[PDB]
Structures are given as C-alpha cells and as structure tokens.
Design an enzyme around this catalytic site. Structure first.
Site, short mmCIF file in Angstrom:
data_model
loop_
_atom_site.label_atom_id
_atom_site.label_comp_id
_atom_site.label_asym_id
_atom_site.label_seq_id
_atom_site.Cartn_x
_atom_site.Cartn_y
_atom_site.Cartn_z
N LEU A 41 0.83 -1.19 0.00
CA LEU A 41 0.00 0.00 0.00
C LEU A 41 0.87 1.25 0.00
CD1 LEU A 41 -1.71 0.71 3.45
CD2 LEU A 41 0.37 -0.61 3.26
N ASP A 42 0.26 2.37 -0.38
CA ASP A 42 0.99 3.62 -0.50
C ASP A 42 1.32 4.21 0.86
OD1 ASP A 42 1.17 3.77 -3.28
OD2 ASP A 42 -0.80 4.72 -3.47
N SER A 43 2.25 5.16 0.84
CA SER A 43 2.54 5.98 2.00
C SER A 43 1.37 6.89 2.34
CB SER A 43 3.79 6.81 1.74
OG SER A 43 3.59 7.70 0.66
#
Ligand SMILES: CCCCCCCCCCCCCCCCCC(=O)OC[C@H](COP(=O)(O)OCCN)OC(=O)CCCCCCCCCCCCCCCCC
Lengths: 87, 176, 128, 157, 606, 95, 459
Positions: A41-43
């Site tokens: 998942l993204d930051s």
C-alpha cells in the site's frame, strides 16, 4: 481520572483498528507486517493509518514520527512510550 | 529543521501538507460523514496526478497547494488537548518534580521508604559504575571531526547500556 | 487565489510559503548542512557537560553570560554622537517633559486665576 | 574563570578578521552573520536575527530548554527579554494585517457613528410628564422649606 | 434589635476559622473539604435568617467599630452596612459557592494540593463578601483589589502552561485599569465632599458629577469585562472549572456593575451618565453576541454569554432602574453557577477534551447532566415563563418604555436573538448530534456529590429566582401598559431566533463546504480585538522601553551627559598641565611672563 | 523509508531500561509507608457568645455606632411605646 | 537618647574581644536588646516634640525611622553570613564592627537637632558604606560602584554646608525649634533661588532624582547584602528625612522653582517604572523600583500638603521594609544559582514550596495590595496630587498599572512554571532565610493592623 492500559490490550486494539480498514486484508495480517515494504500500500494510506491512530488515541504524534514507523509493533511501542504504560 | 537531516524531501513536505490539510478538514467539517466525503475528495485530488515524473510541475503545484490551503484554512483547528498548542500543554506539570531530587531528604524520611531507596542507590551505583570506558570510548571512537548528526548510536560494540541515557530514561511518567 | 499574504513587523511570514525557498541551490544545501553540523556539535558538547554523576552545580552557559554582559555594560562602548542619536535623545528626553510642563503651566494658571476670582466649588474644600 | 576576550566590543570593520572572529565567537554561519550595522545606538557587533523565534519552532523538535525554545547554543537574539512566549506571541495571522486593522477600525467607527445618529434622534412612547403633588414636588428637592414655592398646580385632563 | 446585627456579624466571622485552622494545624487534616462544607452550610443557614427579618420588617442598619486614623476632619472604622442589596445578595453567593465547594470536591479529587486550593478559594470568598458589605469606600477598594489578587492566584493555580499565567497577567492588568478609574472617583469624592463614605455622598447631591462618573465607568468597564477591556474573560476561562464557575458566575465579574448599582442616588440625576451607560452596554452586548459564533470551546461560549448578560445590566442601569439589575444579578448567579457546573461535569466525564468537536452526542447517555444543560439553556432567554423570564423581560420592557437612544434597544434585541441562537448551538452540538468522541468511554456517574450539587442548583434555578423576585418592596413604577408588539415581542424574537438557528443546523446537515466569507472570520478571531491589540500594544511600549529607556535615554545618555564630559575635561586638563619636560628655561620664561602680566596687564601696585 | 536499524537497536535498549525504571518506580510491599454535631454547634455558638458580648457592651457604650433606618409606621397603625393611632387615609371613591 | 548611644559604644568592643564561634550570638542577642530598648522611646505626645539637652529630640518624622534602623540591624547582620564565612575572623569582626559604627552614625543622624550636626552625620553615614560595598561587592565593577556613590553624594551634598553656614550667620543658632520660631519668608530674588537650589539639589542627588539616578543601580548590583539594604532603605529614607527637616524654612519660592523638579520626578517615575520591566539582572529590577517609589516620594514632599506628608512617611516606611526583604530574597536566589541573571534561575514551584510564598507576599506588598502600607502611602499621595493639579492623576495611575505589571512579571518569570532540569544543586531553604522572611513581614502586617503610629507629625 484513572483509565489504565496494558501492552497486550493496546496491541490488540491497534491490530483491531488496522483489521477494520478496507483495502488491506485480514488474511495475511500480523504484528510483523511492514506497510510500504510487503503490504504494497501507498505511504498516503500509511498516513491515513497514523491519522486513524491519532484520532482514536487522542494525542498528536509528531510529524517527524509520521515517517518511519511502517509496522504495527513500533506503533504499539511508540504509543506505550508516549503514554508511559509499564509495570 | 529536524534532528535527522536538514532537507526534508519533496515527498516529506507534500506529506506534511497532506496531514495538516486533512486535519484542517476535520476541523471544518463536523458530523463526520460529510467529512468522510470531503476527505476522500481530497484523496482523489492528490491521486489526480500519481504518475508525475516531472519535478518543476510537482513543486509548482505544491506551491499552488500552499496558496489554495492558506486561502481556506481554519482559525481554531481541533488540536488535540494534550499536544502543544492544545488545552492541556503540560496541564499536570504541577507534579513533574525532577528526579535529581529525592536525594536531599532527611534520613528519617529516608527511613520511611527503605527498599525503594536501596533500589535507587543501586541504580545510581549502576549509573556511575558504567560511565567512563563505554561512553568515553564511544564518544571518541564513533564521532568524525564533525559529529554532524543528533541521533546517537547505542553501545552496540560489546556490553552494557547505550551512552547518554540518564535524563532520557529517568523522566517523569507524564501522570504524576 | 489570494494577494499572497504580505508579512509585517508583527504578522509572521511562515515557512510554508516563502516563496523564495523553492529556488534551492547547492550552496544553500551546503549552508543548511553546516547549520545542522553546528547545532549537532553544540548539543554534543552540551550533553557531555550534562551527563556526569559528579557534576553538582549549574550547566555554565556561555551564551547567556555573553548576552548579559553585551547588554549591560558593553553598550556604553561602542557609541558615537550622530545626528540620529543626538536628535532622538533630545526628542525622547526633554520633549514630553516640556509638553506636560506647558500643560501644567496652563492648568495652574487656570486654578490660580479661578480661585483668585472666587468661582469654585469651595463652599467646603476641606482636605487641603 | 572566563576569558575577557569572549565579550564583544567594536563593530565589523575590518571585514576579514572581524567576521571571522564573530562567526567563531558566536557559533554562527559565517557569511550569514550580519551586523546591525554600526548605527551608534550601542548594539556592539551583536547579530541580527529573524525577529520572531518563539511561536515558530514547533515543540516536537525536542531541544533542550522546554519553554525558552532555545537549544543552548545560538546567538540569543537581542530581544530575548521581550520576544518570548507569554509576553509577545508572533504567530502568523490567519488572514492579513492591514485587512484586520482596517476592518476593526471600520467597525468601531461605524458603531460610534450610529451612536451619534441615535443620540440626535431619541425615541419615546407617547407619554407626558409626571404630575407631582406639591408643585413639582417641593420640600424634598434642594430645600428652602418655608421660603420660596413656585405655585404651579396641575389642572385636570 | 441587636439580634440582626449579631447574626450578620457571625455570618462574617464564620469565614475565618478554616484558614487560621490550617495555618495553625501541624497535624494533617484529610476531611478539610468536609470542614469547609459544614462551615459554609451553617453560614448559609444563619444568613437566611436576617433576610427573613428584613422582609418581615424593613429595618435597615449599618454597623461600625474600631476606628483608626481619625487624622483630619474625616475618620474611618471597619464599617459595613446591611440594606436591601447586601441583604438579598449574600445568601445567593453563599449558596452558589457551597455548590462550587461540592463540585470542587469531586472535580479536584486527584490533585494532592487540595488544601491550598481551598485556602485560596475561601479567602477569595471572604474578600468578595467584604466588597459586598462595605459602606466605607476604602473597604470597598480593599475588597476590589483583594478579589483581583485572588483571581490572579486562582487562575495561575496550574503552574506551567504559560497561556494560563499570561491570562492571569491580563486579568490583573485590567484590574489595575479598574483601579485608576476607582481612585479618580475616590479623589473627587474626597476633595469635593470631605470624605469617601456612601452615607454623606448620598446625603448631598453634587450635581456637577461628570469627572467621578467617568472614573466610575472606567472602573466598571475594567472590572466587568466590557468593551475595550473584555478579552481577559475567555482567557480567564482557560483556568480550571470551579475556578471559572466561582470567578465568573457569581463573583468578581458582577462586582463591576455592583458599584454602579450601589451609587443609584448619585446617578438618579445626570442623564448624560445614563446615556454613556446604555451606549457602552449596548456596544458590549452586540459585540459579544456577534462574537459568539463559531467558538468551539464551551467555556468561551459561556464567557461571551455572561458578557452579554452584563451588557444587559449596563443597559438596565442605563435606565434609572437599579433593583431589576440586582434581581438579574441573583438570577444570573444561580443560572450560570449551575451552567458551569454542568459543563464541568461533561468535560471531566470525557477526559477534559473540553471542545465542541469530538464531543457531539450526549443525550440518552447519563440524561441527568443533559437534563441539567437543557434546563439551563431553557432558562436562558426565559422560555415562557420561568425565573430567567422575569428580570430579563422586565429589563427589555422598561427599556422599550423609556427615553432611550434609538440604537441600544435595537442592539439588545438583536443580541437577545443571538444569545438564543448560540444557546441553540451549544444544545445541538453538545447533545443531539450523532455521537463523535473516541472509544474506551469512561462516562461515569456512580457519584453522590455531583448529583447532589446539580440537584440542588437546578432546584435553585427552578424556584429561588421567583422566590427572590416576588416579595421585594418595589422601588420603581411598574409600567404595565405596553402596545401590540411591545410585550410579547421578546418571546417572538427568541422564537424566530430559534427558527434561524434551526435552519442553520439543517443547512449544516448537508455536504457542501462553502468558503468562509469573513464574517465567519470576523467571529473566530474575536472581532480581531484581542489579537491585534495584544500584538500591537506590547510591541509599542516595550520597543520604546528598549529604545528610549533601557538603551538610549537613561543609561548611555546620562553617562554621556554627567560623567563623560566632566571626566574627559579633567583628563585633558591633567594631560596638558603635567605633560611638561625638563627644560628649566621654559619655567623661568613662565616666571617672566607672570611678572610682566602682574605689572602691565592688571594693576597690582595700583 | 523507516528507521535505520541502529536506531531500532538503541530504541530497544531504551525500552528495556524504561521498563526496568518504571518497575523500580512502583511500590507495594504492603507496608509501603511507615510512620514513626456538638463540635459543630459549639464552633458556631462560641463566636456568637464572644461577638454578642462584644456587640452589646462596647458597641452600646460607643454612641454613634450601629444605627437603623427605622421601621415604617403606617396611618392606620399605632405605637408600642407611646400609643395612639394616626388618622386613616381618607375616602376612596372610584376604587 | 544617650541611653541609646552609649550601649552602641558598649556593644562594639565586645565583638572585638569575642572568642571564636561566639561573635554571632553575642552581636545578635545584644542588637535585639537594643530593639526592645528602641521600642521604649515611642512616646511623642501632642503639641511639641520630645526634647533632650541640646543635641537630642524625637518626632514621628524620626521615631519610626529610628525604630526601623534598629530593627533592621539584626536582620542586616543575619543576612551577612555564609558569604564571608570562609574569610578571616579578624576581617569578620572588622565587617561587623563597621556595620555597628554605621548604625551608630545613623542614630546620630536621625536624632539630630542642628542641620550642621545633620550634615556631619550625613557624610558620616556616607563613609563606611563606601568601604563595605567596594571591598565585598563581589563583581568586577564594585570599584566603579563605590566611586560613583562617593562622588555623587559628596559633590551634591557639599554646597549644602555653605548654605547652612549662611543660615547660621543670618538667623542665629540652628535648632529646629528656633527655625520654627525665627523663620521669615525670603521673596523671589535670585540668591534665594540659588540657596534653595543648593539645599534641595544636594537632597535631590541623595533621593535620587531622575536627572542623577545613575548613582544607584551600580551601587545596588555591586554590593553585599548588608550594605545593599542599608544603602537602599536607610540612605534614601534618610535623604527624604533631611528634606522634610529643611523645607520648614523657605516656603514662598518653592512655588516658583519647584515646577521643574515635580515635572522631572513625574516623567522620570514613568520612565523608570518602564525601564524596570524589561531589563535582565534580577537584582536591578528592585533597584529601579526603589528609584520609582522615591520619585513618588519627592513629588509628595514638594507639593506641601498634610495628607501628602502623612502618605510620604507611610510610603517611606513601607518601601524600606519591602525593598530590604526583596533584596534578601534576591540574595537567597543568588546563593542558589550563582547567576544574578533573571532568565537562568527558573522553576521554584515544585522546588522550594514555601520560599515561593514569601516571594508572593513580597511582590504583593510591592504591588500595593490594599492592606499593605505601600497602598496607604500611594493613596494619600494620589489624593494630594489630584488636589494639586486635577490632571496629573493620569501619570499616577499609569505608574500604578506599570508598577503592578513589573512586580508581578518579576514574580511569574523566574518563579512560575518549569525548572530548566540542569540546575540540580538547590537545597531546600534554610531556617535562617525563612527567619529573615518572618522577621520582615510579621511586623509589616502587625503594623498594618493599627498603623496610626507611622503617620507623620501632621497627625
Ligand atoms: C496606559 C499604559 C499601559 C501600558 C501597558 C504595557 C503592557 C506591556 C506588557 C504586556 C503584556 O503583559 O503582554 C502579555 C499579554 C499577551 O497576551 P496574548 O498575546 O493575548 O496571549 C494570548 C494569545 N493566545 O498582552 C497583554 O496583556 C496586552 C496588554 C493588555 C491591554 C492593555 C490596553 C487595553 C486597552 C486599550 C485601549 C482601550
């Protein structure tokens, strides 16, 4: 003026509210699970996560510490450090 | 301005603006469901342009984001009432008595609390017991001609406790 | 969207929008690195003065003592009489004094001539 | 024991060695040290700083002094007696400065103008004067209890 | 009868034994709240008695004893009175403060410095009592600055939190502006009326009274937190909660208009004075009414509410009507004592998060305190028709039936509508919303003391307003004859304000996010007055203290005037006289010119 | 990025030390410290007795002292000391 | 009062031939005996003074100041150990006997008949304080402080002598009673203005007036604690005492030439109360506080009202007590932190939980809290000055606001909120320091109960 806390209970609460989230899975979910490394998942969602921890536990964690946690174990350790909960 | 480095990054600045803008939307946007709507609208706004390989485009959009954010911030945001700025801000600093004290007491008052004072005496013996070789050898071995950073490494070499630890460990409990 | 938020002598210009930050050069990063190194070395020396069990007294700050001696008795040198210093001292020293002295000339003349005449409220004015 | 040379007389001329000794003695950036200049108002060769210093520097950096916002080695700005928190708080204002002062003085002057417009135009219900019994109520005003009445008795309506 | 005087003096003298008790104790007490409880309880039950005798007879009296400094034609003893105001004010303040003792037993249960807290609070009670009993004006000044100092310490209880002791510093600064106004009043009273005693100042009518009235209005707008000197009131809300309740509900803010209520024979004349009264009160009332929109702190909402109430009382003194203002003091006192105590119940029940945000839903969860808040807010505006109806609507009726200023009536009407809408907003955002606050909820009322205190003060707010209002001898003319839209119009305006706040709420239900349009920004920063004045005037005077005083005019300029000129002249004359060399020919030439200047220049043989 | 692992290690040693220090700070040996109606109304009545002894005698012997706005006699009532009526208010009409 | 003079001469050589570890108890006990002895005098009844063969008399202009000095001596003395404890026994005896000699000449100065004898005892007051502050001033410019002190007090006080010899050989002898009884007005010539200017200017320098008040602050920051309290309280109130004595003669021209001095003192009062807001060096704040209060005293003395003189002596006694106390607490703080600078020593709410109560009580007496006698003085001076000009009350109230502001800022800056967690050497406060606190303030409150004593001869 006395709610007490524990390590195991507050770790279960943090893992609970991570399990509540939509676009991760409870299938492969544990305390030794890095966010950006191997959950993909993204930051951006990672800082939504830290936002959820702040919005539940009622204290701002600093913007220097919204950078370098990435895993639930260090989250539980940092919240137990800010709240000073040991025996 | 931070203990690790000097430059944050472009990504770190974007992210800090993201957290501040989302917090300001929390403050603007009570009943929490219209908040969820507008917050995912903001998340949509930042995923308009995930594929940005340019750099001057990104920083110019960041400056316009600072413009469009300062155009619409909120005067009293909901700041958390234990943080600095908030409603507590060392509210219970009435009893954050520093711990170099509790050593100048009268010995009958020290006879009142025997075992805790024996344990504090053996902690203090541990403190002076492991100052010289470990901390002096680490603070003359690991630093370069400039130290040039503020986070310091532990005593990972051989044995006992990491250096420079007394006034970081023995702080008051924040609920006295 | 906005007239870009001028600062003032009171209105703080925050470090969000300078906008002159964004034209970073290599010498500016070198400057920020040197600033970080200076605060690093000063905090290192501070902690090593700060963490001994045998230390009893104060931390012996040189910066505060520097500022106090530079503010207390190292003002009289240096000094020179300019047009600015002399005019500003003569305008802030005797100006307000001669101003309120003129208004007390006026009020004492009014009071003297008034009770010289006899049109005052001193039917009883006891506590002289 | 302290070195007498570690105080600070005399300004910035000449430019190599004064600036060298100033950046050494003050623990500063070399060419970002700028004197006031030698304005003759005292001030020595003490550094110029960005003047706000206290409502900035967010307290999550965790420096040494928990309230002075200082980390024990800095030029220690010449208005440290006044620019602290709890005396003058120079936070960045949410809107402007001139817009703030012009709206405040406009609102106060508008309220005073309408106070004067109210003072020139009173309001009153249709109501006559009171009808006091003893000739606009003598004997309980200023006095002369048997000397000077002014006879004006009320006639009925 | 001496019984009346004796019981008033024992109601004064009961407020001394806990303080000297803990100062002479040396054996530690733990039931010191129980001790303060029983002594204030018996003080209340012995102060209800002389008011019963008062309405039974009338029979007003003053006492005085132990004179000191009878120096000139005046003198002063410790001298205090009991007429109508000091009769029917003291049990109100005692009842309020006894409930605040209960709520501070529960709220401050955790801090182990409760004894010094009760010492400060009870000493503050003593000093406010000395203010509200005295007729010797010097003793009034004693009570004035004493409650100022107790307000300072009792805000700055929590050391640390530099906002709080800054707030306390602001509070004492505006008390000193009250002091300069009050000493101008005392100076004029001495020099034109031989004394400062209320009896003789009532005994004469010095009709030229513009200077002392301007001083009194300066003192009253200093103490009573009004226009120009209002911003210390929310900053003062940033102390603890029973701190805020006692310091700003029934004491220490109502003393500012209390003196103007005391000087009613002096202000029976001077219509110019009442014009200044009502204009300033209308300014405060509309300013805080506009100012109390989008204020997400609860205590600051209650601060702007009580400042608007004091604006109504300044308009009430703008009409020659003191006793309605006194009745409003009594109703307002019980009213916001109960209201602050309910607010503190809420705030301590959710971990002192204290804000409107993250508190949203509270109804059906311990409905006792929600019941308390809705009784308090329904008593605000006087829902038809309760104790809060009586004083407030007699005020608006007597204001509308008067030779008023065509602006103050309209401003007070608009501000009554606005206090209706922010009472609506505190109800709607604190109680009825969907519940927004975090989990691990510890919402607890297994507690006897808070339920007894809330119990007793809502019983007081239900009945004691009408009980005090009913059986007083009316010292005015009841107007009683109002036209269409001049008697029910207050209720009409409050109900249309409820409609307006209701449609604000229903527009807030949607999902729109429109921009702020600078009335929204004018209301957040408190009309920009505390911000721009507390950033501008501490820059002006302190920068001039740097420039003129501490740098230029004192030190370096006096060192260049006196020592430098003399010292350099003596240095130059010394370094020219003694700087000679050993050629003795020069010294004999000096001898020669001395002989010739003695012969031909100045005659010496002649 | 995350923590550099040396900082993780330093943090872990400080977690051990902070746990042990707070474990020191707790005490409960079950001998933790070791030390080496009528009252109400007498507390109310003895100031009544003292100040009523004071307020009769010295206060009465000082002449211009406690003084009263007198009770208000009425045109239909009488006097306790001397004793006679004041004649009443006159005829009513249109009452 | 020779029964006060000769025990002081019989107290000094006892300290000389006192053995080791026994100087202290002997001096303290016998000075307290002198304090009861001083308390015996207070007898001044009605119409006249209380006289005594030619040299001695007593008024309430002199009796509370004399009681103030002899009460101040043990307080002075017990402040004056632990900062010369490691010095020699002979030098310690020398210091204590120097203070006893200074007290002796102060009693000589307050119990004086002739103004000539007052001048002799005035510069007799001058001389020992020089040696004390210059020897033990404990900083690098105690030299400069003693030198400014001596040269301003001599160079102002000196033509006063010539004017006094002129009054001697124009009016016979110089008893205060003859000058009550043989005085006659001297009209607006020029030499009358010069003689009045010389006398009042000597006393102006002693006050200090605002034109020449750079005299004070070096001599306060660069003095030991005994000489600090003596200097401030007894020297400034001695100057005001001397002005009150001399101003009975030369009435008709002070209305013509008092207008610069009143103006200079008012505007300097405002500027000095502003300058003691923002300085460093915590000691010096109380120094300029004393400057501001003595400026108020000067305005009160020269506007010539009985209310003004009663408030003047009340303000003198109250500010002497408060400033001596607050100097002693400043010495306690300098014992703690070895700094003298304001912003370094912080906290002191957790630490030292009752020393803070004495700081609070001192700052509230300085603030003019309403049972403090400071407020009685300021109130009477405000009444008199509003009778004097009806517009100068604004400067008075602005002084009042700023006075409360800087005193309460001095309280909450160093002593409200957070230790710097690197001080770590303060011990809990000694019983000696608390003994000096309760020797300062208990007579202030017990004088505040029945204060009809301390008001002036125009009672
Ligand atoms: C007459 C001459 C008076 C001279 C006064 C000089 C005052 C200097 C010291 C000011 C001071 O104490 O500043 C502290 C305080 C700061 O408070 P503030 O910045 O509001 O902090 C809360 C913001 N979150 O700032 C203040 O308290 C500001 C000062 C109070 C306002 C004084 C004037 C009000 C009336 C103006 C005219 C009407």
């Amino acid at each position: 003026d006395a709610p007490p806390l524990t390590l195991e209970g507050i770790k279960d609460r943090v893992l609970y509210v991570l399990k509540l989230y939509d676009k991760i899975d409870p299938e492969k979910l544990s305390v030794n699970s890095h966010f950006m490394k191997d959950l993909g998942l993204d930051s951006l969602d990672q800082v939504e996560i830290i936002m959820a921890m702040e919005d539940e536990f009622g204290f701002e964690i600093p913007d220097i510490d919204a950078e370098k946690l990435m895993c639930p174990q260090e989250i539980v350790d940092y919240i137990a450090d800010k709240k000073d909960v040991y025996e | 301005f931070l203990p690790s480095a000097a430059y944050l990054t472009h990504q770190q600045k974007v992210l800090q603006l993201y957290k501040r803008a989302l917090r300001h939307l929390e403050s603007r946007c009570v009943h929490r469901d219209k908040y969820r709507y507008f917050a995912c609208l903001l998340r949509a706004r930042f995923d308009e342009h995930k594929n940005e390989k340019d750099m001057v485009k990104a920083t110019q959009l960041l400056r316009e984001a600072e413009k469009e954010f300062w155009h619409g911030q909120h005067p009293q945001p909901y700041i958390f009432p234990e943080s600095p700025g908030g409603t507590s801000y060392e509210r219970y600093e009435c009893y954050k008595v520093p711990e170099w004290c509790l050593d100048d007491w009268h010995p009958s008052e020290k006879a009142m609390y025997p075992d805790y004072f024996a344990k504090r005496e053996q902690w203090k013996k541990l403190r002076r017991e492991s100052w010289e070789r470990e901390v002096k050898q680490l603070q003359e071995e690991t630093p370069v001609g400039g130290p040039r950073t503020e986070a310091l490494p532990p005593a990972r070499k051989q044995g006992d406790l990491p250096p420079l630890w007394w006034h970081i460990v023995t702080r008051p409990r924040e609920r006295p | 969207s906005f007239p870009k938020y001028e600062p003032s002598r009171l209105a703080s210009l925050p470090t969000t929008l300078d906008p002159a930050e964004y034209d970073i050069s290599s010498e500016t990063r070198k400057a920020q690195a040197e600033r970080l190194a200076i605060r690093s070395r000063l905090k290192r020396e501070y902690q090593l003065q700060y963490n001994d069990p045998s230390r009893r007294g104060v931390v012996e700050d040189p910066a505060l003592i520097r500022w106090t001696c530079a503010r207390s008795a190292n003002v009289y040198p240096n000094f020179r009489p300019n047009t600015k210093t002399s005019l500003l001292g003569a305008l802030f020293g005797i100006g307000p004094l001669i101003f309120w002295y003129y208004v007390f000339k006026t009020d004492r003349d009014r009071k003297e001539k008034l009770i010289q005449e006899g049109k005052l409220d001193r039917t009883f004015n006891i506590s002289y | 024991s302290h070195i007498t040379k570690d105080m600070l007389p005399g300004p910035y001329p000449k430019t190599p060695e004064e600036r060298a000794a100033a950046a050494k003695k003050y623990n500063m950036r070399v060419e970002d040290y700028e004197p006031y200049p030698d304005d003759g108002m005292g001030y020595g060769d003490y550094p110029k700083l960005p003047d706000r210093s206290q409502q900035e520097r967010d307290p999550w950096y965790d420096w040494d002094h928990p309230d002075l916002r200082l980390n024990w080695g800095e030029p220690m700005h010449w208005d440290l007696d006044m620019y602290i928190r709890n005396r003058v708080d120079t936070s960045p204002t949410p809107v402007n400065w001139n817009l703030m002062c012009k709206h405040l003085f406009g609102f106060v002057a508008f309220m005073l103008f309408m106070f004067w417009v109210g003072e020139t135009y009173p309001t009153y219900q249709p109501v006559g004067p009171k009808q006091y019994p003893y000739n606009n109520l003598y004997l309980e005003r200023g006095g002369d209890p048997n000397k000077e009445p002014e006879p004006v008795v009320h006639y009925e309506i | 009868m001496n019984l009346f005087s004796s019981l008033t003096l024992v109601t004064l003298i009961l407020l001394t034994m806990p303080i000297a008790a803990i100062n002479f104790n040396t054996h530690k007490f733990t039931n010191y709240p129980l001790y303060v409880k029983t002594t204030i309880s018996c003080a209340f039950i012995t102060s209800m008695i002389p008011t019963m005798m008062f309405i039974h007879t009338g029979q007003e009296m003053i006492i005085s004893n132990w004179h000191w400094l009878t120096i000139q034609t005046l003198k002063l003893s410790l001298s205090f009175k009991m007429d109508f105001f000091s009769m029917m004010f003291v049990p109100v303040a005692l009842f309020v403060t006894w409930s605040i003792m209960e709520f501070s037993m529960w709220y401050m249960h955790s801090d182990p410095n409760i004894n010094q807290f009760f010492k400060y609070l009870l000493l503050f009670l003593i000093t406010m009592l000395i203010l509200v009993t005295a007729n010797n004006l010097f003793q009034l000044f004693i009570g004035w600055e004493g409650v100022g100092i107790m307000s300072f310490l009792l805000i700055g209880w929590w050391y640390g939190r530099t906002d709080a002791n800054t707030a306390a510093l602001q509070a004492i600064l505006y008390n000193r502006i009250g002091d300069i106004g009050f000493i101008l009043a005392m100076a004029w009273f001495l020099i034109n009326l031989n004394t400062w005693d209320l009896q003789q100042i009532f005994m004469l009518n010095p009709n030229d009274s513009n200077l002392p009235l301007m001083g009194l209005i300066l003192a009253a707008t200093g103490k009573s937190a009004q226009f120009g000197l209002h911003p210390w009131l929310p900053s003062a809300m940033e102390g603890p909660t029973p701190v805020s309740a006692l310091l700003h509900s029934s004491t220490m803010v109502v003393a500012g208009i209390f003196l103007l209520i005391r000087f009613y024979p002096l202000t029976e004349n001077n219509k110019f004075g009442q014009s200044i009264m009502l204009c300033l009160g209308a300014m405060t009332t509309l300013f805080t009414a506009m100012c109390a929109l989008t204020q997400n702190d609860i205590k600051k909402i209650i601060a702007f509410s009580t400042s608007s109430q004091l604006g109504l009382m300044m308009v009430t003194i703008g009409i020659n009507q003191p006793h309605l203002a006194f009745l409003h003091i009594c109703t307002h006192a019980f009213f916001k004592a109960m209201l602050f105590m309910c607010s503190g119940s809420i705030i301590h029940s959710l971990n002192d998060e204290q804000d409107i945000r993250k508190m949203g839903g509270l109804f059906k969860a311990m409905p006792f305190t929600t019941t308390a808040l809705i009784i308090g807010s329904l008593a605000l505006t006087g829902m038809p028709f309760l104790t809060g109806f009586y004083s407030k609507d007699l005020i608006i009726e007597s204001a509308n039936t008067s030779y008023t200023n065509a602006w103050a009536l309209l401003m007070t009407l608009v501000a009554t509508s606005f206090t209706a809408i922010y009472s609506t907003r505190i109800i709607f955002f604190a109680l009825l919303g969907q519940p927004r606050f975090p989990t691990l909820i510890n919402i607890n009322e297994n507690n006897p003391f808070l339920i007894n205190s809330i119990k007793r003060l809502l019983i007081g707010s239900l009945f004691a307003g009408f009980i005090i209002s009913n059986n007083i001898p009316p010292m005015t003319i009841p107007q009683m004859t109002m036209p269409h839209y001049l008697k029910m119009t207050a209720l009409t305006v409050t109900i249309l304000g409820f409609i307006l706040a209701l449609e604000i709420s229903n527009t807030t239900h949607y999902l729109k996010f429109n921009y702020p349009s600078n009335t929204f920004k004018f209301s957040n920063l408190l009309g920009y007055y505390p911000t721009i004045m507390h950033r501008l005037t501490p820059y002006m005077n302190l920068t001039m203290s740097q420039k003129s005083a501490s740098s230029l005019l004192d030190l370096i300029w006096l060192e260049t005037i006196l020592p430098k000129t003399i010292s350099l002249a003596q240095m130059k004359m010394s370094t020219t006289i003694t700087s000679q060399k050993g050629l003795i020919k020069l010294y004999f030439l000096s001898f020669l010119i001395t002989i010739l200047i003695s012969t031909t220049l100045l005659n010496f043989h002649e | 990025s995350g923590y550099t692992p040396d900082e993780k290690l330093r943090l872990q040693q400080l977690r051990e030390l902070r746990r042990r220090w707070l474990k020191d700070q707790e005490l409960s040996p079950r001998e933790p410290v070791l030390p080496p109606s009528i009252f109400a109304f007498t507390h109310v009545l003895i100031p009544v007795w003292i100040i009523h002894y004071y307020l009769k005698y010295h206060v009465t012997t000082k002449p211009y002292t406690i003084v009263e706005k007198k009770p208000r006699i009425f045109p239909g009532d009488t006097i306790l000391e001397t004793g006679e009526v004041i004649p009443p208010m006159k005829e009513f009409p249109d009452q | 009062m020779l029964k006060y003079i000769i025990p002081t001469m019989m107290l000094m050589p006892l300290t000389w031939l006192s053995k080791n570890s026994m100087i202290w108890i002997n001096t303290t006990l016998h000075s307290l005996l002198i304090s009861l002895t001083s308390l015996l005098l207070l007898n001044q009844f009605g119409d006249n003074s209380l006289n005594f063969s030619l040299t001695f008399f007593s008024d309430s202009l002199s009796t509370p100041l004399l009681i103030l000095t002899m009460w101040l001596l043990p307080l002075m003395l017990m402040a004056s150990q632990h900062h010369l404890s490691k010095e020699n026994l002979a030098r310690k005896k020398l210091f204590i006997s120097m203070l006893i000699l200074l007290q002796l000449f102060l009693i000589m100065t307050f119990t004086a008949t002739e103004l000539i004898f007052f001048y002799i005892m005035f510069e007799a007051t001058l001389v020992p304080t020089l040696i004390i502050i210059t020897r033990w001033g404990n900083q690098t410019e105690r030299l400069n402080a003693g030198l400014y002190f001596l040269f301003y007090t001599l160079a102002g006080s000196l033509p006063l002598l010539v004017a006094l010899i002129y009054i001697q050989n124009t009016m016979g002898s110089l008893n205060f009673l003859i000058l009550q009884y043989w005085v006659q007005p001297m009209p607006n010539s020029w030499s009358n203005t010069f003689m009045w200017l010389a006398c009042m200017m000597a006393f102006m320098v002693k006050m200090p007036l605002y034109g020449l008040h750079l005299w004070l602050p070096k001599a306060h920051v660069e003095a030991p604690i005994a000489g600090s309290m003596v200097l401030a309280a007894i020297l400034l109130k001695l100057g005001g005492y001397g002005m009150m004595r001399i101003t009975l003669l030369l009435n008709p021209i002070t209305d013509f030439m008092a207008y610069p001095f009143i103006m200079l003192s008012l505007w300097g009062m405002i500027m000095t109360s502003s300058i003691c807001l923002r300085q460093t060096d915590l000691k010096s704040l109380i120094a300029y506080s004393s400057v501001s209060h003595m400026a108020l005293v000067i305005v009160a003395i020269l506007i010539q009202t009985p209310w003004s003189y009663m408030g003047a002596t009340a303000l003198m006694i109250a500010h002497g007590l408060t400033s001596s106390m607050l100097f002693c607490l400043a010495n306690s703080n300098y014992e703690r932190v070895h700094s003298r600078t304001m912003i370094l020593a912080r906290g002191l709410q957790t630490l030292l939980p009752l020393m803070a109560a004495w700081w609070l009580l001192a700052s509230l007496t300085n603030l003019a809290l309403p049972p403090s006698i400071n407020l009685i003085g300021e109130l009477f001076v405000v009444m008199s000055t509003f009778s004097w000009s009806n517009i100068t009350i604004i400067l008075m109230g602005l002084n009042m606001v700023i006075t409360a502001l800087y005193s309460l800022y001095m309280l909450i800056t160093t002593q409200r909120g957070k230790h710097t967690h690197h001080i770590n050497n303060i011990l809990p406060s000694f019983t000696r320091e608390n003994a000096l606190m309760s020797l300062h303030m208990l007579p202030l409150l017990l004088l505040s109960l029945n204060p009809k004593i301390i008001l002036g001869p125009l009672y």
